[PDB]
Amino acid sequence: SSFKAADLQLEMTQKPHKKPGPLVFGKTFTDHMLMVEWNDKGWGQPRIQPFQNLTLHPASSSLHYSLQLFEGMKAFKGKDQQVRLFRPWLNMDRMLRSAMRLCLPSFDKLELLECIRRLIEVDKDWVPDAAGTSLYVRPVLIGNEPSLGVSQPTRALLFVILCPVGAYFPGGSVTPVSLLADPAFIRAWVGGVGNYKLGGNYGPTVLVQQEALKRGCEQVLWLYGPDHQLTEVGTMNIFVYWTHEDGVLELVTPPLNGVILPGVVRQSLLDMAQTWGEFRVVERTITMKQLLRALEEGRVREVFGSGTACQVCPVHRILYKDRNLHIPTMENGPELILRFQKELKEIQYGIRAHEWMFPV
Amino acid sequence: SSFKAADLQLEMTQKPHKKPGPLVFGKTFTDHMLMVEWNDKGWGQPRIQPFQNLTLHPASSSLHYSLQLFEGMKAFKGKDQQVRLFRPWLNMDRMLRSAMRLCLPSFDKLELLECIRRLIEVDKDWVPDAAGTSLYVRPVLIGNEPSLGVSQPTRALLFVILCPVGAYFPGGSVTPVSLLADPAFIRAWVGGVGNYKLGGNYGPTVLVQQEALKRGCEQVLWLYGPDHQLTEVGTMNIFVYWTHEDGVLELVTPPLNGVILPGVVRQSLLDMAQTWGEFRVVERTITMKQLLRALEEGRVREVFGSGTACQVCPVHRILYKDRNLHIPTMENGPELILRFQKELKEIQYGIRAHEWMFPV
Ligand SMILES: *Cc1c(COP(=O)(O)O)cnc(C)c1O
Ligand SMILES: *Cc1c(COP(=O)(O)O)cnc(C)c1O
Ligand SMILES: Cc1c(C(=O)O)sc2ncn(C)c(=O)c12
Ligand SMILES: Cc1c(C(=O)O)sc2ncn(C)c(=O)c12
Ligand SMILES: [Cl-]
Ligand SMILES: [Cl-]
């Protein structure tokens, strides 16, 4: 069963918030939210209502056993003032896989997307239009059983909130980051749930990020296995553009073998690069041994993260235990990074019509 | 920094709820709860208040990034109608470790214990006194940042709720369980957070527990490593009583190497067995290979889980690689299980005076 967009009830706010004139991520919210409840009778009617607090029983399984998941995607306003979502169907697919993994109720992906469209329409004037700005969309699905039994919930709650966000690069120019690479830290494991966007994967990273700051780095490079596989960078997927040990110029990102969150940007980068057909594009594990060797031999061109936050984020330094490694990304253009950002911009802000964009 | 039981505020319930007459675990709650708030100004005053809903900001870090941890302990009412907590100091020590792992605010263990005592004192009439019954105490600490950044919270809530519970073994006698042992399912990893009582560790197990029921078993035997180490049973620590390969009779449980939750009952069983001095008590890795051989050689006496839910739970069958292994636990009395159950019962209900009991 599923809630239907046709049954949406609109409750307009009677206390609209003043909109921002420095947009700090995730702190400023729009006037309305989507809310849908689920119980033994199935899904209730979906509603667009004023942004407000959640009321939760103290035994809510959302709070005791982390029956919670979320999504993250962006709406962009072009010069034509039309608002469009970037490949939202993929976020809906990923959200439904997350729900199944936590035994939370299934919903219809197109119905949720239409409800999200309607919510964005209502708050469309919150969508900024300055260069590099967007509206960040945060759907959440939580279990809400008033019981301490660890079990499949008989009640759940689905909601969506929205945040206007400023440019990730406030100088209009990509700025690289430093990463702490310590094999002591583990984000996810084969047989785990690191490949789903579940609240539980993020909580334990807070301390590790504090340690990266203490050691003078900006983000965490998550290592896995005896061979020190480079898996992810903070909450971004990792890409390396290099001449591989067989003399072939290639773009590589780690495969979806369970420890990688399948990013929408990640898939888009692979799609674009495969479409150009100008170099080899692979999904393969990347080890610190291969990286060190490639740096020494001058084979590394660019290393970057991909994610909804920044789209593409250059890396210039990796602190691996005591060894400070310069990554020559910015000394190589960064040609690929700039090319990806340009093409994504064209697609996202409607400069070039595209099947990847969902109009609001 | 900590809140003080000396500054405790009380507010009695306007309309007391009626006590139970068939109690399912975790569904029925008492009249009051403890609540303490934390922010930039530190801990506010703790307060005992009527059982009421939580009001959370939609961006609460508790719901997006699983900034949440909990405890579980029991209070027992003896014939003298006096209520006692079992080794609550250990639960406080554990909770604080959990808090520090999630960068949640430190508190004073004795102050919280006193606040909990006071709360149970207020609801003392909810503590049942029929055989095998108790009050389950559920302290929770959650982050409550009203922003979407993954970061150390600047706001948190600590609360405690209470549940009266019936006997785990309704017939008044230990009944054994069957376990599904499939290496595909991984509860925790070295370097991870399985040794903390965080909500994130439990959500992912719901689906696995459903698979266990699907395949005809009652709980999950969590295996780890290429050597298939027996780590835990459901949410219980695992113990094996056997004649070891060296011909010596021993009680063995896996060591606290990172993938094992340090259970309070677990520690108590080791403490008791060591005090008796009748056989070897050891913390050592247990592999399926060892177990299989021991079973074929008739060397296994008893296999059981330990935890607050049941104290001690016999195991009679493990389904491993499509093959059903019979565990002869009940055929051996189960002597050790019964002995542990009886001594814990005598201590917990005040039949024998003991420093492990904390009077309310
Ligand atoms: C969200 C996320 C990503 C990137 O996903 P996108 O869908 O591209 O924004 C990568 N890794 C982790 C751990 C994430 O949570
Ligand atoms: C709670 C728990 C235990 C047992 O702990 P006790 O303190 O004895 O109740 C064992 N294993 C796991 C995974 C747990 O969550
Ligand atoms: C989505 C997101 C972040 C996150 O996912 O936490 S951090 C962050 N910083 C800047 N900008 C522009 C973002 O969009 C952003
Ligand atoms: C604490 C607990 C459970 C849990 O923590 O899931 S399940 C359960 N079943 C029975 N009894 C008596 C308990 O105390 C109990
Ligand atoms: Cl995947
Ligand atoms: Cl430990």
Taking the CA of A283 as reference, the closest ligand is: 5
The rounded distance, in Å, linking the Cα atoms of A177 and A310 is: 12
Chain-centroid distance of CA B88 in Å reads: 12
Helix (H, G, I), strand (E, B) or coil at A291: helix
Question: Do A58 and B159 make contact, defined as CB atoms within 8 angstroms?
Answer: yes
Q: Which amino acid is at A148?
A: L
Tell me the C-alpha distance between B78 and B84, whole Å.
8
What is the C-alpha separation between A28 and A9, in angstroms, rounded? 24
A237 lines ligand 1 (CB under 6 A): yes
Contact partners, residue B152, CB within 8 Å, separation at least 6? A206, A210, B103
Question: Cα B181 from chain centroid?
Answer: 21
Supply B112's token pair: 């919280």
Of A61, A230, A20, A227, nearest to A144 by C-alpha is A61
User: In the structure, how many helices (H) and strands (E) does chain A have?
Assistant: 7, 20
**HSE-up (13 A, CA, CB side) for residue B1:** 11
Any A CB within 8 A of B106 CB: no
In whole angstroms, give the CA distance from residue A360 to residue A114: 9
Task: Work out the number of other CB atoms within 10 angstroms of the CB of residue A358.
Answer: 17
Of A148, A189, A210, the CB nearest to B26: A148
Handedness of CA A275, A281, A283, A287 (dihedral sign): negative
- B203 vs A contacts (CB less than 8 Å): 65-68, 102, 143, 198, 200
Would you say the C-alpha torsion A106, A108, A113, A115 has a positive or negative sign? negative
Structure tokens at B345: 């019962």
Report whether residue B96 contacts ligand 2, using a CB cutoff of 6 Å: no
Whether residue B60 and residue A54 make contact (CB cut-off 8 A), yes or no, is yes
- Amino acid at position B153, single letter: P
Q: How far apart are the first and last CA of chain B?
A: 25
Residue A161: list chain B partners with CB under 8 A. Answer: 58-59
For residue B238, give the nearest of B327, B152, B156 by alpha carbon. B327
Binary contact (A26, B147; C-beta < 8 A)? yes
Q: How far is A220 from chain B (nearest CA, A)?
A: 13
Residue B10's DSSP bridge partners are B48
What stretch of H or E contains A36? Answer: strand A32-39
Provide CB contacts within 8 A for A219, sequence distance 6+.
Answer: A177, A178, A179, A180, A209, A212, A233, A234, A305
Which residue intervals of chain B bear CATH 3.30.470.10? Answer: 1-170+346-360
Query: This structure's resolution (angstroms)?
Result: 1.9
Strand runs (DSSP E) across chain B, as ranges? 9-10, 32-39, 42-43, 47-50, 54-56, 68-70, 73-77, 83-86, 134-143, 156-165, 177-181, 219-224, 229-233, 236-243, 249-253, 280-283, 300-307, 311-320, 323-326, 357-359
Which part of chain A has CATH 3.20.10.10?
171-345
Q: A273 C-alpha to center of ligand 3: Å?
A: 24
CA distance A137 to A335: 30
Contact B295, B301 (CB under 8 A): no
Q: What is the 3-state secondary structure (H, E, C) of A178-201?
A: EEEECCCCCCCCCCCCCCCCEHHH
Helix axes A264-276, A88-101, angle to 10 degrees: 130
Exposed/middle/buried for B256, CB within 10 Å: 0-12, 13-18, 19+? middle
Calculate ∠ Cα B47-B49-B52, nearest 5°: 130
- CB atoms < 10 A from the CB of B302, how many? 26
B33/B139 Cα distance (integer angstroms): 10
For A268-286, the DSSP string reads HHHHHHHHH-SSEEEE---
* Ligand positioned closest to the Cα atom of A136: 3
Q: Count other C-beta atoms under 10 Å from residue A49's C-beta.
A: 18
Strand partners, A181: A320
Question: What is the number of alpha carbons within 13 Å of residue B273 lying toward its C-beta?
Answer: 25
B102 vs A102, A206, A209: nearest CB: A206
Q: How many CB atoms lie within 10 A of CB A296?
A: 9
To the nearest whole angstrom, how far is the Cα of B255 from the nearest Cα of chain A?
20
What tokens does B350 get? Answer: 């005040």
CA–CA gap between residue B19 and residue B32 (Å, rounded): 13
Instruction: Return the closest-CA partner of residue B231 out of B185, B272, B197, B267.
Output: B185
CA distance A301 to A294: 10
Closest CA to A84 of A150, A151, A135: A135
Cα dihedral sign for A149, A153, A156, A160? positive
From chain A, the residues in CB contact with B146 under 8 A are 27
Q: Which atom of ligand 1 is nearest to the CA of A309?
A: 9
CB A144 within 8 A of CB A57: yes
Place of tokens 């604080």: B96
| Contact criterion met (CB below 8 Å) for A157 and A37 | yes
Alpha carbons B232 and B253: distance in angstroms, whole number: 9
CA distances from B74 to B29, B178, B265 (A): 14, 26, 11
Instruction: Count other C-beta atoms under 10 Å from residue A22's C-beta.
Output: 6
Distance CA B44, CA B35 (A): 10
Q: Which tokens belong to B97?
A: 């470790």
Q: B303: which strand partners?
A: B240
Task: Give Dmax (Cα) for chain A.
Answer: 65
Distance A72 CA to ligand 1 centre (A): 8
Q: Which helix (H) or strand (E) holds A288?
A: helix A288-296
User: What are the phi and psi torsion angles at B272 (to 5°)?
Assistant: -60, -50
Helices (runs of H) and strands (runs of E) counted in chain B = 7, 20
Nearest chain A residue (CA) to B152: A206
Residue B281 pairs with which residues in a beta bridge?
Answer: B251
CA–CA gap between residue B347 and residue B344 (Å, rounded):
5
What whole-number distance in Å separates Cα of residue B23 and Cα of residue B21?
9
Cross-chain residue pair A62–B60, CB shorter than 8 Å: no
Give the residue from A303, A162, A173 showing the smallest Cα distance to A236.
A303
CB B161 within 8 A of CB A59: yes
The rounded Cα B323 to chain-centroid distance in angstroms is: 30
Contact B119, B162 (CB under 8 A): yes
Structure-token pair, residue B62: 């508790």
User: 3-state class of A222 per DSSP?
Assistant: strand
Give B36's DSSP letter: E
Among candidate residues A329, A255, A334, A249, the one with its CA nearest the CA of residue A295: A329
Distance CA A305, CA A178 (A): 11
- A225: nearest Cα among A188, A252, A256, A195: A188
Residue B123 DSSP SS3: coil
d(CA A319, CA A216): 9
* Token pair for B318: 């493990």
- If DSSP codes are grouped into helix, strand and coil, which group holds residue A111? helix
* DSSP structural state of residue B45: -
Known binding residues of B for substrate are: 136
Determine contact, residues B207/B347, Cβ cutoff 8 Å.
Answer: no
- Class of the CATH domain delimited by A171-345: alpha beta
Distance CA(B342)–CA(B321), nearest Å, equals: 36
Phi/psi at A210 (5° precision): -60, -40
CA distance B283 to A77: 61
User: What three-state secondary structure class fits A310?
Assistant: coil
In chain B, breaks (C-N over 2.5 A) are found after 21
Residue A146 has what DSSP assignment?
Answer: B
Are A235 and B150 inside 8 Å of each other by CB? yes
Within its chain, how far is the Cα of A25 from the centroid?
A: 13
Those residues with Cβ within 8 angstroms of residue A355's Cβ, 6 or more apart along the chain or in another chain: none
Q: Which residues partner with B75 through β-bridges? A: B85, B135
Residue A320, number of CB atoms within 10 A of its CB: 18
A-to-B residue pairs, Cβ atoms closer than 8 angstroms:
194
Beta bridge partners of B243: B249
- Residue A340 tokens read as 């990806």
Within 182-241 of B, beta carbons closer than 8 Å to A belong to 184-186, 189-193, 198-207, 209-210, 235
Q: Which amino acid is at A331?
A: E
Q: What is the DSSP string of B132-160?
A: T-EEEEEEEEEE--SS-S-S--S-EEEEE
Residue B150 to residue A25, Cβ atoms within 8 A:
no
With beta carbons less than 8 A apart as the criterion, state whether B180 and B324 touch. Answer: no
- Could you tell me the fold of the domain covering A1-170+346-360? D-amino Acid Aminotransferase; Chain A, domain 1 (3.30.470)
Which neighbouring-strand residues pair with B224? B229
Q: Beta A177-181 vs A311-320: how paired, if at all?
A: parallel
Nearest one of B254, B315, B268, B256 to B73, comparing CA atoms:
B268
- Are residues B164 and B20 in contact, defined by beta-carbon separation less than 8 angstroms? yes
Which member of B25, B186, B203 has the closest CB to residue A65? B203
A224 annotated to bind ligand: no
Nearest alpha carbon to residue B167 among B311, B54, B37: B311
Task: Specify the DSSP class assigned to residue B215.
Answer: T
Question: How many whole angstroms separate alpha carbon A5 and alpha carbon A32?
Answer: 16
B55 close to A (CB below 8 A): yes
Q: How many CB atoms neighbour CB A178 within 10 A? A: 19
Pairing of strands A219-224, A134-143: unpaired
Neighbours of A227 (CB within 10 A): 12
Q: Using CA positions, which residue lies closest to atom 2 of ligand 1?
A: A235
Is B309 buried (19+), middle (13-18) or exposed (0-12) by CB count in 10 A? middle
Beta-strand relationship, B177-181 and B219-224: parallel
Residue B275 DSSP code: H
The span from the CA of A312 to the CA of A336, in Å, is: 10
